[PDB]
Amino acid sequence: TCPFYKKIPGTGFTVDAFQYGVVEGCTAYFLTHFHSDHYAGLSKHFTFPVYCSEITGNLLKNKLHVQEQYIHPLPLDTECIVNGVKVVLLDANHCPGAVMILFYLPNGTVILHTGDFRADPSMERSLLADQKVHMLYLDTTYCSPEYTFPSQQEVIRFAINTAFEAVTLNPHALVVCGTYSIGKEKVFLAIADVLGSKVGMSQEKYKTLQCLNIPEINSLITTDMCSSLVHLLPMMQINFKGLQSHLKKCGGKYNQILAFRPTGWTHSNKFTRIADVIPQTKGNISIYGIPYSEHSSYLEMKRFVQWLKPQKIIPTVNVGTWKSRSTMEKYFREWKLEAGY
Ligand SMILES: CC(=O)Nc1ccc(Nc2ccccc2)cc1
Ligand code: NI
């Protein structure tokens, strides 16, 4: 059955609720972003209205084959009316096409659903700033003070500098980047840009990236693996066996692999700095795990919530255990008291 935290009170709406069959009294289904835990259940046989961003709509049509007559894309930062309720889609700073949703209830209640997000001070100057928000449905993935990570900018500088050094020392080294979903495209695009190369990948991945409205994408990506010295592979293949196998398939064009896994967090963050990250190495293969997050750190989340000052907070992640629920509630109370309420 559909959990309470995917239901929007006083409306016919659900959010990211496609795996529960037909939901009782749901007149419109919202999808915040194209990640499988959120879209699970959608297909060509879905015949209810789906509301989403333009990019999410492109992916629904082309990857899942949802019929166009049931896809309702909305522009960002624009007041729209859906089944008689005013809504706004805001950029979530997660993966391409990911949104937060503002709902203005007929009775005057205002609700923000963050979907998945990485909180940023730039959000403090969107349409959020223009009215009080009463209820917040919050992405609490990393809601604990141990979750510190660097900026995306610092992590990308590290990856660019590491790749440029390696390939300048050895022109016969291949760079490989792991992927298993949309998001974190900057990792492989910034590396390819510093090496003067296109990124090579499967036909299926190339199709996915063509759905994203990235400027000048025909200029950065390719299915011609032979022309490219940055290759994308499934995340499952980023290990010594998988990479040894790939190197054999390149026909003696390359004699070394430098590979990146762009993981969310790793307990190395609790001890170590970004400058101090080191690879796992075996023979002519090195694997770097880099802390590229598309979710809020604890401090970023805290700042957003103390700025917004909602009346009620409803977590949407880590809700399955009493210990996690209790821990999150205690942090919310701390944040409230520190702000003076
Ligand atoms: C679980 C639940 O609903 N509790 C709750 C709700 C709202 C706040 N709001 C707040 C936070 C920081 C600063 C000013 C207000 C804090 C805790
Ligand atoms: Ni996500």
Side-chain angles (χ1 to χ4, degrees), residues 1-23 25-203 205-215 217-240 242-247 249-269 271-281 283-311 313-341:
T1 63
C2 185
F4 76 97
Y5 68 84
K6 299 186 178 278
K7 294 169 178 186
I8 309 298
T11 67
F13 305 153
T14 58
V15 180
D16 301 346
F18 300 92
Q19 71 178 288
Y20 311 100
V22 179
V23 183
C26 184
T27 62
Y29 292 78
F30 281 79
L31 183 58
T32 63
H33 69 286
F34 197 75
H35 279 167
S36 70
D37 277 3
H38 300 259
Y39 70 74
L42 276 158
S43 72
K44 73 166 79 172
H45 309 288
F46 199 82
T47 53
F48 290 90
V50 183
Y51 287 86
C52 59
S53 72
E54 175 176 11
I55 284 164
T56 298
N58 296 338
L59 295 161
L60 292 182
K61 179 188 170 162
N62 288 289
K63 300 293 298 192
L64 300 184
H65 300 293
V66 177
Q67 298 179 45
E68 180 155 282
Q69 70 180 125
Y70 306 123
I71 302 174
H72 297 263
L74 311 168
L76 298 191
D77 300 318
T78 298
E79 296 176 329
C80 304
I81 312 303
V82 175
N83 299 356
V85 180
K86 185 161 68 166
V87 307
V88 171
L89 299 191
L90 303 166
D91 204 286
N93 186 39
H94 183 57
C95 62
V99 301
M100 316 192 286
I101 314 162
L102 261 186
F103 303 93
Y104 298 80
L105 268 48
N107 75 352
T109 305
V110 180
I111 297 163
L112 179 65
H113 199 300
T114 67
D116 284 345
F117 86 140
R118 183 162 186 178
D120 194 76
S122 67
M123 298 171 174
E124 303 168 14
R125 302 167 271 288
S126 64
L127 301 195
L128 279 179
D130 301 13
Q131 73 293 282
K132 189 178 166 59
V133 174
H134 305 84
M135 308 174 80
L136 179 63
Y137 289 69
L138 176 65
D139 170 15
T140 46
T141 299
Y142 296 123
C143 189
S144 193
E146 69 264 31
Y147 298 112
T148 56
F149 21 76
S151 74
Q152 291 176 166
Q153 188 266 325
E154 301 170 67
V155 174
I156 293 297
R157 186 96 271 211
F158 174 83
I160 286 168
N161 289 352
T162 300
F164 179 83
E165 183 193 61
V167 175
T168 296
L169 291 175
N170 180 195
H172 301 273
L174 176 64
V175 182
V176 175
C177 291
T179 190
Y180 52 28
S181 62
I182 65 166
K184 309 183 178 186
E185 287 81 9
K186 191 71 177 176
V187 179
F188 54 85
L189 299 175
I191 292 165
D193 174 79
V194 79
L195 299 175
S197 183
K198 289 190 177 172
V199 187
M201 61 191 70
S202 70
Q203 296 175 242
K205 187 70 191 185
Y206 182 92
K207 165 186 190 180
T208 302
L209 295 184
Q210 287 291 164
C211 300
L212 306 184
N213 306 349
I214 284 177
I217 204 75
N218 294 337
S219 72
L220 315 153
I221 62 171
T222 187
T223 51
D224 182 0
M225 307 299 294
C226 290
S227 75
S228 156
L229 63 145
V230 182
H231 295 174
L232 293 195
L233 286 183
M235 200 74 86
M236 75 161 41
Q237 204 170 339
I238 313 306
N239 52 70
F240 295 117
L243 293 167
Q244 279 185 222
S245 175
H246 189 64
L247 191 57
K249 282 164 265 173
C250 293
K253 196 167 206 293
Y254 306 106
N255 63 3
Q256 180 182 354
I257 288 177
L258 169 72
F260 295 92
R261 299 167 41 79
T263 50
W265 154 83
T266 14
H267 181 45
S268 36
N269 290 345
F271 306 128
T272 329
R273 292 166 125 82
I274 188 56
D276 308 329
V277 172
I278 61 166
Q280 280 197 236
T281 298
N284 60 342
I285 298 171
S286 294
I287 308 176
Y288 284 85
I290 63 177
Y292 193 96
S293 182
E294 295 187 335
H295 295 272
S296 313
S297 74
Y298 173 83
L299 289 174
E300 290 164 352
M301 191 188 304
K302 175 176 182 292
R303 177 191 171 100
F304 179 76
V305 177
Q306 292 179 312
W307 172 81
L308 193 71
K309 303 171 163 75
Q311 296 179 354
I313 300 167
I314 296 127
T316 67
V317 187
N318 308 306
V319 305
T321 79
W322 301 114
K323 195 170 173 207
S324 298
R325 282 191 157 288
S326 182
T327 298
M328 293 189 291
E329 285 171 356
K330 290 162 56 264
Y331 290 123
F332 304 152
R333 175 76 85 182
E334 296 220 308
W335 302 348
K336 186 187 161 96
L337 294 167
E338 189 207 334
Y341 297 77

